[PDB]
Amino acid sequence: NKIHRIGKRKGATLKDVSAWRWIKTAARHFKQEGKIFVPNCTEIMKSSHGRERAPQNPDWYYIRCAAVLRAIYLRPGVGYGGLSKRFGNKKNYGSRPEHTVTSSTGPLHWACKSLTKLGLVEPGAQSGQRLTRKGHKFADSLAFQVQIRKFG
């Protein structure tokens, strides 16, 4: 079948499922639960000054929170600057040639703060952000749900 376990495999972990499918499922969970803190600036700000227009998705902040949660899972000890390199893009300068610009650290600071309020991430000892035990459990449990095709 499509969701049957492959032989001796049982359970699931992050990186065993589609990254986007996990992120969208986490974003849906964050919105459905309703406990996550959403800044009022997300309704008018852009994700980065390198972007040309607004994020165009009503739930873009929940998706960004899920994306940074997955990023902190992959690389413990990451900071706002390290996350900015992940979500940067190429800026259009008009008649001048294009250049890579890192993402704004404002939304990344807000996203980490929202996750810390939920208890999923904590300030890592000696700089950076890290996933809590609850955060690691949340990521793996949702990864299994994605594999089972449960979603929300």
For 31-91, the DSSP string reads HHH--S---GGGGT--S-TT-SS----TTHHHHHHHHHHHHHHHSTTB-HHHHHHHH-EEE
Q: Does 137 bind RNA (CB under 7 A)?
A: no
Distance, in Å, from the CA atom of 74 to the CA atom of 20, rounded to the nearest integer, reads 14
101 three-state secondary structure:
strand
Distance, in Å, from the CA atom of 71 to the CA atom of 75, rounded to the nearest integer, reads 6
Q: Which of residues 99-128 bind RNA (CB under 7 A)?
A: 99-101, 104-107, 109-110, 112-113, 123-128
Taking the complex as a whole, how short is the minimal distance between the CB of residue 116 and another protein, in angstroms?
Answer: 26
Q: Does 24 bind RNA (CB under 7 A)?
A: yes
Residue 90 binds what, of RNA, another protein, Mg ion, none (CB under 5 to 8 Å, by partner type)?
A: RNA
Known binding residue 57? Answer is no
Known binding residue 94? Answer is yes
Q: Does 52 bind RNA (CB under 7 A)?
A: yes
Q: Does 141 bind RNA (CB under 7 A)?
A: no
